[PDB]
């Protein structure tokens, strides 16, 4: 019946994996909430855990914090009785173990130790927020001393600490107040660094925490407009090399735009130093994304026309020897920071900004690299580098057409994007400029996780447009050939191609004849129920009574 929790406690001071995991697993059971073991047996377990955490060989500590986490999560009485004492012990060990950091990270287990301690503190103070009476008198006299330690530790371990301070700053905006300057310093020291040794997650977290720093109606607006105003100097610095006023409607808009960062220097004899310009614009875009896409405890003014104008002027930036070669690569990356901002302005706000959904699609044509000589032809060698960016473009288009829907008039950007997507759907080879008797082994074959993205884009195109003939026949040939190839290689057809053939059957558009019976010939032993309804239709849905 009952597993005698004293037995778990006494077998816990020594327990390796295949015993310790059973101890943690059986302690989930709710029958340890019951009369007259609530003052004499849980006390024994908690004193055992406390003796494990208070002094140990750094294995009993890891074991102990995991044990307290599981116990407090699956038993609210242990929380309401002893959570303050457990959290005090864990914070004390964290404090002594972060008083030194370069003698505690010396053995490849200090990192995991900080991970488990920080995670355990976070989990405890994420369960003591559903109890007002308990968030008093166990956390609030302790956060004043918890938070400076976490700040000092975030200088070295931002990937692990910053979500905790983010949640604490968000749920408590009045105890983080007198430490706020001390936080800001470290965040400017983490942005003044190279800022590419940090991951995307860490970059986003420092941006988000700097954004939530300004919670202390109006300060959010000041920080937001400061970051928005730090865009125009960089663009005018880029305008001394692209020679604007060749097109004046752009230069009218550039001067129509409205601080801790260094004013940067550029040298043309060292063209690699031109990689500072994208690596500042991406930074400011991340900070802007943080100020915009985050939740708040109050509403906020967000300028949408301003950032739309900013995105519009970013994608206008396009068309001694190696310098020209380096200029031919930074500019797509510059445009992509307009793409990356419209993708967040679209999904998070949705139909707000419906007015801008037609200009974005026209401006995406500027992102496409054309051949240099005079022509409207696509430069496929540049497109081979830009794969992730064009995937982001495809997701942006699919985000827009969820709201716009089917479109009467057609535009030219979609046909060029289809040509791009059909180029990217071909198995790349990188020996074409020239063997060793086998040039077919030097290919980069396209996974199915990429074909899914391409096929979702073609679904969006065939749904909402009556396309021209040749950009339709290419799609049909692609779908049929690849489906047959995969049905030979495999014994089946993946689901994205089936969805593509479904859309090709349902939405033929300008065609005078469907591809229905060929889809069924391919779907011979892979049956599906869409075409049953099409060929063998059903009685309506209310005739039955």
């Amino acid at each position: 019946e009952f597993i005698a929790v004293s037995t778990l406690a006494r077998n816990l001071e020594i327990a390796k994996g295949n015993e310790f995991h059973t101890i943690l697993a059986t302690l989930r059971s709710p029958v340890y909430i019951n009369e007259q073991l609530l003052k004499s047996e849980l006390s024994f377990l908690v004193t055992k855990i406390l003796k494990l955490i208070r002094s140990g060989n750094d294995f009993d500590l890891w074991k102990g914090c995991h044990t307290s986490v599981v116990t407090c999560a699956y038993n609210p009485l242990v929380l309401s009785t002893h959570g303050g004492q457990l959290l005090a012990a864990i914070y004390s060990r964290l404090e002594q173990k972060t008083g030194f950091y370069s003698s505690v990270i010396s053995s490849s287990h200090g990192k995991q130790l900080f991970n488990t301690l920080i995670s355990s503190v976070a989990i405890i103070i994420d369960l003591m927020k559903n109890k007002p009476t308990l968030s008093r008198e166990a956390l609030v006299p302790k956060l004043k001393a918890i938070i400076p330690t976490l700040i000092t530790l975030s200088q070295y371990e931002p990937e692990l600490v910053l979500p905790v301070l983010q949640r604490i700053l968000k749920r408590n905006t009045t105890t983080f107040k007198p430490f706020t300057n001390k936080f800001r310093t470290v965040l400017i020291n983490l942005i003044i660094s190279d800022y590419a040794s940090l991951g995307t997650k860490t970059q986003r977290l420092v941006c988000e925490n700097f954004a939530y720093l300004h919670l202390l109606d109006s300060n959010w607006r000041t920080g937001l407009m400061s970051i928005l105003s730090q865009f125009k100097p960089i663009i005018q610095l880029c305008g001394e090399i692209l020679d604007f006023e060749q097109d004046n409607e752009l230069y009218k808009l550039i001067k129509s735009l409205p601080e801790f960062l260094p004013s940067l220097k550029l040298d043309f004899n060292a063209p690699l130093t031109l990689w500072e310009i994208p690596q500042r614009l991406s930074l400011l875009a991340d900070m802007l994304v943080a100020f915009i896409s985050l939740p708040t405890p109050f509403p906020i003014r967000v300028p949408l026309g301003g950032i739309n104008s900013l995105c519009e002027v970013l994608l206008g930036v396009s068309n001694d020897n190696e310098l020209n070669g380096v200029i031919n690569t930074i500019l797509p990356q510059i445009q992509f920071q307009g793409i990356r901002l419209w993708e967040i302005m679209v999904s998070k706000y949705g139909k707000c900004g419906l007015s801008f959904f037609e200009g974005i699609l026209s401006s995406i044509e500027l992102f496409i690299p054309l051949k240099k000589k005079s022509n409207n032809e696509i430069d496929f060698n540049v497109v081979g580098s830009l794969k992730f960016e064009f995937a982001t473009v495809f997701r942006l288009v699919n985000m827009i057409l969820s709201h716009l829907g089917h479109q009467l008039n057609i535009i030219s950007v979609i046909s060029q994007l289809i040509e791009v997507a059909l180029f990217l759907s071909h198995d790349k080879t990188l020996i074409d400029s020239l063997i060793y008797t086998h040039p077919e082994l030097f290919v980069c074959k396209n996974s199915m996780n990429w074909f899914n993205e391409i096929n979702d884009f073609f679904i969006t195109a065939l749904n909402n447009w009556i396309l021209p003939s040749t950009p339709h026949i290419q799609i049909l040939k692609y779908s049929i050939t690849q489906s047959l190839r995969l049905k030979e290689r495999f014994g089946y057809i993946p689901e994205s191609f089936v969805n593509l053939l479904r859309c090709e059957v349902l939405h033929p558009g300008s065609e005078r004849v469907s591809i229905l019976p060929i889809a069924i010939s391919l779907l011979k032993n892979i049956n599906d129920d869409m075409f049953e309804l099409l060929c063998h239709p059903k009685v309506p849905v209310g005739m039955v009574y």
């Binding site: 488990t116 109050f298 003014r301 967000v302 706000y349 007015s355 959904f357 716009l404 679904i459 005739m543």
Partner: protein, 399 residues
Amino acid sequence: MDEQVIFTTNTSGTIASVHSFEQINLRQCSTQSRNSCVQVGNKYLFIAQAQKALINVYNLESVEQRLPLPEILKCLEVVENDGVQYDRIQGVNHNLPDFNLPYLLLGSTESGKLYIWELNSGILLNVKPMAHYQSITKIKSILNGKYIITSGNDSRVIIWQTVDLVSPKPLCILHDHTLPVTDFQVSSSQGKFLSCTDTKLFTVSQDATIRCYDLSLIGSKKSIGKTPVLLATFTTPYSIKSIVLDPADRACYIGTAEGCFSLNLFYKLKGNAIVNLLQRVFSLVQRLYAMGQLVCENVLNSNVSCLEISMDGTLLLIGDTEGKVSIAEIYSKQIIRTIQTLEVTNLLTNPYKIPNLQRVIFDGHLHDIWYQIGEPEAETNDFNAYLEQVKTQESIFSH
């Protein structure tokens, strides 16, 4: 079901429920219209006030705010925002924020002056000074925000395409009646992307004529849009004031003077046969088919001002001319409950700070909006993931 029910007379308005005897009257209300009220979000309730040139706004008690306006306006509608409670980048669901509002506010007055406002920041976005040459009886968003339908006493229905209404030149115009249009409803289903290729428009006017249209040619781009074809029309005896449907669409319930009548669309002929009438002209009668006529049944005898179907397709809500609403049941044609307050301008049901507006059009210029994103659901699970996480860390420890 247990939906809440709203209605407003020319003297008062109230909110109640179908399966309860609890009622909440509203202090300040004065109305003359068929459609002058709508809930924005799940929180707020707009009502256009008569003879004062302003909106009253209520929470779901007392007037919270009052919105001054340029003119006394007759009809209201709102285009809800969707695709925001779920991120297609992160894959996370979001809770509704404490401040949520729709994109648009469509207001109309007599003489056809169609106002189009943006509610997040109160901005006069667009004004069509003459769209009907007459008043506007009802304006509606058929789909989510795709299209805007509006009918007036010029005996015309106008189909505006919403995206090229905010950046003029409407899409389809329907003049097939001889008298003011009083009501219209829509039956639709949606593909993976929202459009009109199976949707059906039911139009109802003082001609004693029901007219059913198919909208599947409207995107063909031959006004702008290629005109639809009417598939069916009916001729009623009496001057008709409202129409409501079944949601499976199976039945048309018509509200007029002298009670509310019911047509079955899946008409049951002799033997075992059924005929669908919505895949022609017909003549209705009260209480077999190739004669050219169909048989209706009657549920009431009272004068009707407005109608609404229940969600469960079994209860009518008929608001009569005597300031009360009757909750019916179709199979019995019997009354369950009569709600009164302490005619009916409008009726509606659903299951369970604001900026002030401008008077000058918006013409880069910092087109601002007030907004709030809302938290994820993870800030308002599995043990085996935690167990793998603590398992794999054991190998890092060794002494």
